[PDB]
Short mmCIF file of C-alpha atoms and ligand atoms in Angstrom, two decimals:
data_model
loop_
_atom_site.label_atom_id
_atom_site.label_comp_id
_atom_site.label_asym_id
_atom_site.label_seq_id
_atom_site.Cartn_x
_atom_site.Cartn_y
_atom_site.Cartn_z
CA UNK A 2 0.10 0.01 -0.02
CA UNK A 3 2.92 2.33 -0.92
CA UNK A 4 3.32 5.23 -3.46
CA UNK A 5 6.45 5.44 -5.53
CA UNK A 6 8.09 8.75 -6.52
CA UNK A 7 10.90 9.40 -9.07
CA UNK A 8 12.68 12.74 -9.49
CA UNK A 9 16.24 13.47 -10.70
CA UNK A 10 17.83 16.85 -10.69
CA UNK A 11 19.89 15.83 -13.67
CA UNK A 12 16.66 16.21 -15.93
CA UNK A 13 17.08 20.06 -15.30
CA UNK A 14 20.20 20.15 -17.70
CA UNK A 15 18.18 20.28 -20.86
CA UNK A 16 17.77 23.92 -21.60
CA UNK A 17 17.22 26.56 -24.26
CA UNK A 18 20.49 28.25 -24.88
CA UNK A 19 18.93 30.96 -27.07
CA UNK A 20 15.88 31.91 -24.92
CA UNK A 21 16.31 31.16 -21.28
CA UNK A 22 12.58 32.13 -20.69
CA UNK A 23 11.16 29.50 -23.00
CA UNK A 24 8.29 28.04 -20.91
CA UNK A 25 9.54 24.40 -20.87
CA UNK A 26 11.96 25.37 -17.97
CA UNK A 27 14.41 23.31 -16.06
CA UNK A 28 12.75 24.50 -12.78
CA UNK A 29 9.40 22.94 -13.89
CA UNK A 30 10.52 19.70 -12.11
CA UNK A 31 12.52 21.17 -9.24
CA UNK A 32 9.53 23.37 -8.20
CA UNK A 33 7.23 20.43 -8.17
CA UNK A 34 9.64 18.31 -6.22
CA UNK A 35 10.07 21.14 -3.60
CA UNK A 36 6.27 21.53 -3.34
CA UNK A 37 6.13 17.80 -2.47
CA UNK A 38 8.60 18.41 0.34
CA UNK A 39 6.84 21.53 1.63
CA UNK A 40 3.50 19.58 1.83
CA UNK A 41 5.26 16.57 3.53
CA UNK A 42 4.36 14.23 0.72
CA UNK A 43 7.92 13.19 -0.27
CA UNK A 44 8.65 11.50 3.09
CA UNK A 45 5.42 9.51 2.59
CA UNK A 46 6.63 8.06 -0.70
CA UNK A 47 9.02 5.19 -1.52
CA UNK A 48 11.85 6.82 -3.62
CA UNK A 49 12.40 5.11 -7.01
CA UNK A 50 15.73 5.86 -8.65
CA UNK A 51 15.95 7.29 -12.12
CA UNK A 52 18.00 5.39 -14.68
CA UNK A 53 18.75 5.89 -18.52
CA UNK A 54 16.44 4.14 -21.01
CA UNK A 55 18.61 1.91 -23.28
CA UNK A 56 18.52 2.36 -26.98
CA UNK A 57 16.84 -0.97 -27.24
CA UNK A 58 14.01 0.27 -25.07
CA UNK A 59 13.61 3.35 -27.14
CA UNK A 60 13.30 1.04 -30.17
CA UNK A 61 10.03 -0.19 -28.55
CA UNK A 62 8.45 2.85 -30.21
CA UNK A 63 11.06 4.85 -32.10
CA UNK A 64 12.97 4.16 -35.42
CA UNK A 65 16.64 3.60 -35.14
CA UNK A 66 17.21 6.69 -37.44
CA UNK A 67 15.18 8.94 -35.11
CA UNK A 68 17.01 7.68 -32.06
CA UNK A 69 20.49 8.00 -33.86
CA UNK A 70 19.68 11.54 -34.87
CA UNK A 71 18.85 12.77 -31.35
CA UNK A 72 21.84 10.89 -29.92
CA UNK A 73 24.02 12.81 -32.47
CA UNK A 74 22.95 16.20 -30.73
CA UNK A 75 25.14 15.14 -27.64
CA UNK A 76 28.38 16.62 -29.36
CA UNK A 77 26.96 19.39 -31.47
CA UNK A 78 28.17 22.97 -31.51
CA UNK A 79 25.31 25.67 -30.81
CA UNK A 80 24.95 26.30 -34.49
CA UNK A 81 24.18 22.66 -35.39
CA UNK A 82 21.93 22.20 -32.36
CA UNK A 83 19.90 25.21 -33.76
CA UNK A 84 19.86 23.71 -37.23
CA UNK A 85 18.67 20.27 -35.90
CA UNK A 86 16.04 21.65 -33.47
CA UNK A 87 14.68 23.76 -36.39
CA UNK A 88 13.95 20.55 -38.46
CA UNK A 89 11.21 19.91 -36.09
CA UNK A 90 7.93 21.59 -35.02
CA UNK A 91 8.68 23.47 -31.67
CA UNK A 92 11.88 21.81 -30.49
CA UNK A 93 14.93 23.28 -28.77
CA UNK A 94 18.07 21.08 -28.16
CA UNK A 95 21.09 21.45 -25.93
CA UNK A 96 23.98 18.97 -25.51
CA UNK A 97 22.31 17.56 -22.42
CA UNK A 98 18.78 17.05 -24.12
CA UNK A 99 19.34 13.41 -25.21
CA UNK A 100 20.44 12.20 -21.71
CA UNK A 101 17.52 14.11 -20.02
CA UNK A 102 15.07 12.28 -22.51
CA UNK A 103 16.57 8.89 -21.74
CA UNK A 104 16.37 9.72 -17.93
CA UNK A 105 12.71 10.73 -18.22
CA UNK A 106 11.91 7.40 -19.98
CA UNK A 107 14.09 5.25 -17.75
CA UNK A 108 12.47 6.84 -14.66
CA UNK A 109 9.08 5.84 -15.80
CA UNK A 110 10.17 2.38 -16.73
CA UNK A 111 11.55 1.82 -13.22
CA UNK A 112 8.28 3.15 -11.82
CA UNK A 113 6.27 0.86 -14.02
CA UNK A 114 8.48 -2.04 -12.87
CA UNK A 115 8.01 -1.11 -9.20
CA UNK A 116 4.12 -1.22 -9.67
CA UNK A 117 4.10 -4.45 -11.68
CA UNK A 118 6.43 -6.37 -9.40
CA UNK A 119 4.21 -5.20 -6.34
CA UNK A 120 6.94 -3.03 -4.69
CA UNK A 121 4.42 0.01 -4.75
CA UNK A 122 0.82 0.22 -5.62
CA UNK A 123 0.97 3.40 -7.65
CA UNK A 124 3.61 6.00 -8.53
CA UNK A 125 4.33 9.64 -9.60
CA UNK A 126 7.20 10.56 -12.13
CA UNK A 127 8.44 14.25 -11.93
CA UNK A 128 10.20 14.26 -15.34
CA UNK A 129 11.25 16.47 -18.36
CA UNK A 130 11.55 16.82 -21.30
CA UNK A 131 7.84 15.77 -21.88
CA UNK A 132 6.93 12.93 -24.24
CA UNK A 133 3.40 12.78 -25.89
CA UNK A 134 3.96 14.79 -29.10
CA UNK A 135 7.02 12.58 -30.07
CA UNK A 136 6.36 10.37 -33.01
CA UNK A 137 8.01 7.02 -34.05
CA UNK A 138 10.30 8.92 -36.53
CA UNK A 139 10.32 12.55 -35.23
CA UNK A 140 10.50 14.97 -32.29
CA UNK A 141 7.78 17.56 -31.77
CA UNK A 142 6.44 20.10 -29.33
CA UNK A 143 9.17 19.95 -26.69
CA UNK A 144 9.23 16.16 -26.79
CA UNK A 145 12.04 13.84 -28.16
CA UNK A 146 10.91 10.35 -27.22
CA UNK A 147 7.44 9.35 -26.22
CA UNK A 148 7.84 8.46 -22.46
CA UNK A 149 4.23 7.37 -21.77
CA UNK A 150 4.07 5.29 -25.07
CA UNK A 151 7.43 3.68 -24.31
CA UNK A 152 6.33 2.94 -20.72
CA UNK A 153 3.25 1.03 -21.99
CA UNK A 154 5.47 -1.07 -24.32
CA UNK A 155 8.07 -1.59 -21.41
CA UNK A 156 5.24 -2.77 -19.17
CA UNK A 157 4.13 -5.26 -21.95
CA UNK A 158 7.75 -6.40 -22.30
CA UNK A 159 7.98 -7.68 -18.66
CA UNK A 160 4.34 -9.25 -18.46
CA UNK A 161 2.70 -10.08 -21.84
CA UNK A 162 2.35 -8.46 -25.15
CA UNK A 163 -1.25 -8.06 -24.64
CA UNK A 164 -1.29 -6.47 -21.17
CA UNK A 165 -4.05 -4.00 -21.19
CA UNK A 166 -2.79 -0.49 -20.67
CA UNK A 167 -4.92 2.53 -20.45
CA UNK A 168 -3.25 5.98 -21.17
CA UNK A 169 -5.30 8.94 -20.03
CA UNK A 170 -3.72 12.13 -21.46
CA UNK A 171 -5.15 15.05 -19.69
CA UNK A 172 -2.45 17.48 -20.84
CA UNK A 173 -4.31 20.30 -22.56
CA UNK A 174 -2.72 19.33 -26.02
CA UNK A 175 -3.47 16.26 -28.04
CA UNK A 176 -0.65 13.53 -27.64
CA UNK A 177 -0.44 13.10 -31.50
CA UNK A 178 2.47 10.73 -30.96
CA UNK A 179 0.77 8.56 -28.50
CA UNK A 180 -2.31 8.18 -30.67
CA UNK A 181 -0.25 7.30 -33.86
CA UNK A 182 1.95 4.72 -31.98
CA UNK A 183 -1.09 2.83 -30.58
CA UNK A 184 -3.56 3.62 -33.59
CA UNK A 185 -3.91 -0.07 -34.66
CA UNK A 186 -3.56 -1.44 -31.21
CA UNK A 187 -6.36 -2.91 -29.10
CA UNK A 188 -4.05 -3.58 -26.10
CA UNK A 189 -3.48 0.10 -25.31
CA UNK A 190 -6.61 2.31 -25.00
CA UNK A 191 -5.55 5.92 -25.54
CA UNK A 192 -7.96 8.63 -24.13
CA UNK A 193 -7.04 12.17 -24.59
CA UNK A 194 -8.93 15.38 -23.52
CA UNK A 195 -7.53 18.38 -25.17
CA UNK A 196 -8.24 21.90 -26.46
CA UNK A 197 -8.82 21.53 -30.31
CA UNK A 198 -10.54 24.85 -31.62
CA UNK A 199 -11.22 23.18 -34.89
CA UNK A 200 -7.53 22.73 -35.60
CA UNK A 201 -6.50 26.27 -34.45
CA UNK A 202 -4.82 24.88 -31.30
CA UNK A 203 -1.47 23.15 -31.29
CA UNK A 204 -0.57 20.63 -32.71
CA UNK A 205 -3.05 21.92 -35.44
CA UNK A 206 -4.24 18.62 -36.89
CA UNK A 207 -7.61 17.09 -37.60
CA UNK A 208 -6.04 13.82 -36.08
CA UNK A 209 -7.25 15.21 -32.70
CA UNK A 210 -10.92 15.30 -33.63
CA UNK A 211 -13.53 13.01 -32.08
CA UNK A 212 -14.06 11.00 -35.24
CA UNK A 213 -10.52 9.48 -35.00
CA UNK A 214 -11.53 6.24 -33.19
CA UNK A 215 -8.64 3.95 -33.98
CA UNK A 216 -7.73 1.83 -37.13
CA UNK A 217 -7.97 -1.89 -37.88
CA UNK A 218 -7.96 -4.06 -34.71
CA UNK A 219 -7.52 -0.76 -32.84
CA UNK A 220 -10.92 0.50 -33.87
CA UNK A 221 -12.66 1.83 -30.73
CA UNK A 222 -9.44 2.08 -28.83
CA UNK A 223 -8.60 5.83 -29.50
CA UNK A 224 -10.75 8.28 -27.76
CA UNK A 225 -10.45 11.96 -28.50
CA UNK A 226 -12.32 14.47 -26.40
CA UNK A 227 -11.72 17.83 -28.14
CA UNK A 228 -12.80 21.18 -26.73
CA UNK A 229 -13.82 24.09 -28.77
CA UNK A 230 -15.07 27.63 -27.78
CA UNK A 231 -12.51 28.78 -25.25
CA UNK A 232 -12.14 28.36 -21.37
CA UNK A 233 -12.93 24.99 -19.78
CA UNK A 234 -12.47 23.90 -16.23
CA UNK A 235 -13.58 21.44 -13.54
CA UNK A 236 -17.19 21.22 -14.56
CA UNK A 237 -16.23 20.04 -18.18
CA UNK A 238 -13.47 17.80 -17.07
CA UNK A 239 -15.62 16.15 -14.37
CA UNK A 240 -18.40 15.68 -16.99
CA UNK A 241 -16.02 14.12 -19.47
CA UNK A 242 -14.73 11.74 -16.86
CA UNK A 243 -18.30 10.71 -15.77
CA UNK A 244 -19.78 10.24 -19.23
CA UNK A 245 -16.78 9.08 -21.25
CA UNK A 246 -13.48 8.31 -19.48
CA UNK A 247 -14.63 6.21 -16.50
CA UNK A 248 -17.29 4.17 -18.43
CA UNK A 249 -15.05 3.33 -21.34
CA UNK A 250 -12.12 2.53 -18.88
CA UNK A 251 -14.26 0.22 -16.75
CA UNK A 252 -15.38 -1.68 -19.88
CA UNK A 253 -11.76 -1.91 -21.17
CA UNK A 254 -10.65 -3.29 -17.68
CA UNK A 255 -6.99 -2.01 -17.84
CA UNK A 256 -4.24 -3.91 -15.97
CA UNK A 257 -2.16 -0.69 -15.80
CA UNK A 258 -3.23 2.87 -16.06
CA UNK A 259 -0.64 5.56 -17.12
CA UNK A 260 -1.58 9.25 -16.94
CA UNK A 261 0.00 11.58 -19.45
CA UNK A 262 -0.36 14.20 -16.79
CA UNK A 263 0.32 17.62 -18.28
CA UNK A 264 -0.84 20.34 -15.98
CA UNK A 265 -1.34 22.99 -18.78
CA UNK A 266 -5.12 22.83 -18.50
CA UNK A 267 -4.56 24.44 -15.06
CA UNK A 268 -5.97 27.71 -13.91
CA UNK A 269 -3.05 30.11 -14.48
CA UNK A 270 -1.29 28.40 -17.44
CA UNK A 271 -0.27 30.88 -20.21
CA UNK A 272 -0.33 28.32 -22.98
CA UNK A 273 -3.57 26.29 -22.04
CA UNK A 274 -6.04 29.12 -21.24
CA UNK A 275 -8.14 26.81 -19.17
CA UNK A 276 -9.23 26.78 -15.46
CA UNK A 277 -8.75 23.22 -14.10
CA UNK A 278 -8.10 23.53 -10.27
CA UNK A 279 -5.82 21.46 -8.00
CA UNK A 280 -8.79 19.96 -6.42
CA UNK A 281 -10.03 19.12 -9.93
CA UNK A 282 -6.81 17.20 -10.74
CA UNK A 283 -6.99 15.44 -7.35
CA UNK A 284 -10.58 14.21 -8.15
CA UNK A 285 -9.50 13.10 -11.60
CA UNK A 286 -6.71 11.05 -9.89
CA UNK A 287 -9.02 9.51 -7.43
CA UNK A 288 -11.37 8.31 -10.10
CA UNK A 289 -8.58 6.66 -11.96
CA UNK A 290 -7.51 4.87 -8.80
CA UNK A 291 -10.61 2.76 -9.03
CA UNK A 292 -9.10 1.04 -12.08
CA UNK A 293 -6.58 -1.74 -12.58
CA UNK A 294 -6.55 -2.56 -8.77
CA UNK A 295 -5.11 0.94 -8.23
CA UNK A 296 -2.14 0.42 -10.55
CA UNK A 297 -1.75 4.00 -11.63
CA UNK A 298 1.57 5.80 -12.82
CA UNK A 299 1.27 9.73 -13.10
CA UNK A 300 3.88 11.01 -15.70
CA UNK A 301 4.54 14.69 -16.10
CA UNK A 302 3.90 16.08 -19.57
CA UNK A 303 3.38 19.93 -20.07
CA UNK A 304 2.24 22.59 -17.68
CA UNK A 305 4.10 25.93 -17.43
CA UNK A 306 2.71 28.01 -14.50
CA UNK A 307 5.28 26.91 -11.94
CA UNK A 308 2.85 27.52 -8.96
CA UNK A 309 -0.04 25.76 -10.74
CA UNK A 310 1.91 22.67 -11.76
CA UNK A 311 3.42 22.36 -8.33
CA UNK A 312 0.16 22.68 -6.52
CA UNK A 313 -1.72 20.42 -9.01
CA UNK A 314 0.75 17.54 -9.30
CA UNK A 315 1.23 17.54 -5.48
CA UNK A 316 -2.46 17.10 -4.99
CA UNK A 317 -2.46 14.06 -7.47
CA UNK A 318 0.27 12.56 -5.24
CA UNK A 319 -1.78 13.21 -2.11
CA UNK A 320 -4.61 11.24 -3.82
CA UNK A 321 -2.29 8.39 -4.64
CA UNK A 322 -1.26 8.23 -0.98
CA UNK A 323 -4.86 7.66 0.12
CA UNK A 324 -5.80 11.21 1.29
CA UNK A 325 -9.54 11.93 1.20
CA UNK A 326 -10.59 13.68 -2.09
CA UNK A 327 -12.24 16.93 -2.49
CA UNK A 328 -16.01 17.48 -2.68
CA UNK A 329 -16.14 19.86 -5.54
CA UNK A 330 -23.52 23.99 -15.65
CA UNK A 331 -21.18 23.17 -18.56
CA UNK A 332 -20.24 25.59 -21.28
CA UNK A 333 -22.62 24.85 -24.23
CA UNK A 334 -19.79 23.75 -26.60
CA UNK A 335 -18.47 21.22 -23.91
CA UNK A 336 -21.94 19.52 -24.01
CA UNK A 337 -21.60 19.41 -27.86
CA UNK A 338 -18.07 17.84 -27.59
CA UNK A 339 -19.11 15.24 -25.08
CA UNK A 340 -22.15 14.23 -27.26
CA UNK A 341 -20.00 14.05 -30.29
CA UNK A 342 -17.67 11.69 -28.64
CA UNK A 343 -20.54 9.64 -27.17
CA UNK A 344 -22.01 9.19 -30.74
CA UNK A 345 -18.56 8.21 -32.14
CA UNK A 346 -17.90 5.63 -29.41
CA UNK A 347 -21.22 4.00 -28.85
CA UNK A 348 -20.61 1.42 -31.54
CA UNK A 349 -17.55 0.15 -29.66
CA UNK A 350 -18.50 0.61 -25.94
CA UNK A 351 -21.81 -0.89 -24.70
CA UNK A 352 -21.66 1.30 -21.61
CA UNK A 353 -22.21 4.35 -23.72
CA UNK A 354 -25.49 3.12 -25.07
C1 LIG B 27 3.81 27.15 -31.73
S1 LIG B 27 3.08 27.08 -30.22
O1 LIG B 27 1.91 26.24 -30.33
O2 LIG B 27 2.77 28.45 -29.83
N1 LIG B 27 4.04 26.34 -29.24
C2 LIG B 27 4.17 24.89 -29.52
C3 LIG B 27 3.87 24.07 -28.26
C4 LIG B 27 3.04 24.54 -27.22
C5 LIG B 27 2.60 23.80 -26.25
C6 LIG B 27 3.21 22.44 -26.08
C7 LIG B 27 2.80 21.53 -24.98
O3 LIG B 27 2.58 21.95 -23.97
N2 LIG B 27 2.62 20.20 -25.33
N3 LIG B 27 2.13 19.30 -24.28
C8 LIG B 27 3.98 22.06 -27.18
N4 LIG B 27 4.39 22.88 -28.25
C9 LIG B 27 5.10 27.14 -28.56
C10 LIG B 27 6.40 26.96 -29.18
C11 LIG B 27 7.51 27.55 -28.59
C12 LIG B 27 7.25 28.44 -27.45
C13 LIG B 27 5.94 28.61 -27.05
CL1 LIG B 27 5.60 29.68 -25.68
C14 LIG B 27 4.88 27.91 -27.57
K1 LIG B 28 -4.40 15.49 -23.92
K1 LIG B 29 -5.24 2.45 -29.34
ZN1 LIG B 30 0.58 20.46 -23.33
#
């Protein structure tokens, strides 16, 4: 009945040498870690060590070409780092980037291992750079390797190929990389909530719309919950969980839950423009704890208001530790989004009928 926590200060070394105010800051993870100490959560957790992912583990989801290219950045001069980062959509690279990406992934593997071997019930991973925009063959959106997708495959690699893994992605952006990696896969249920604005919101693709339900044997196993029409918050996230996330998850019956836990839908976030509260994130966490016999790993993705992400992620950890949850009308367009997803998924999930 133990909660694991992984954090390693070495993941601060990845930085933007041309713009020190770029919002994907080293101090995102140190601020979150400090808040856990201040709230006396850290001493309640079992500390899981970080490690490097191996290149073989990266190949669970990424091409050997992509791995090779990111690894080559380790010894590049600034000019070539700039050139390489510019080949991608919204990437900056320093000499430390590759090692940090490997540590973020390795940290999550050790956390998944700790859960699946019964050393801990659940776990939190305070890691950067983030993962969910990274594709098999490319980096994107501050992400180099898809930490959460790699973690699902790593979990399968130590149990069975068909281990049922639910990934709930509540980062305010669509995890395009996670969707694509698992698009034909019925072993990994991908559920994302995200601001969409008919394609105006990053990463600017119709791949994030509610009608993208999965392909082939994966049909029904990709659930996109897209928001349009500006600010959303706790009422809309709670309704999406009540009507969609939780009934689908219960029918899937996952054996492991991974949360692509960006905190950029948080009140105060400059990039997300949403109003989800720390108490909101705590309730979402508590709901997910009802799945998979409590086997939940919370993985940091985005989230840029240092105070907001520190309070919100700490409240999720408080829930994992078994603390009592909070006791908390929708925007019109949110009702429209939820009903669109319900209609898209009723052919696949009896619970929605
Ligand atoms: C071009 S942009 O959209 O303004 N954008 C891309 C972006 C935004 C958010 C995320 C994210 O949080 N993903 N989870 C990833 N990439 C961006 C790029 C560089 C700097 C800033 Cl402030 C914003
Ligand atoms: K998301
Ligand atoms: K899938
Ligand atoms: Zn995000």
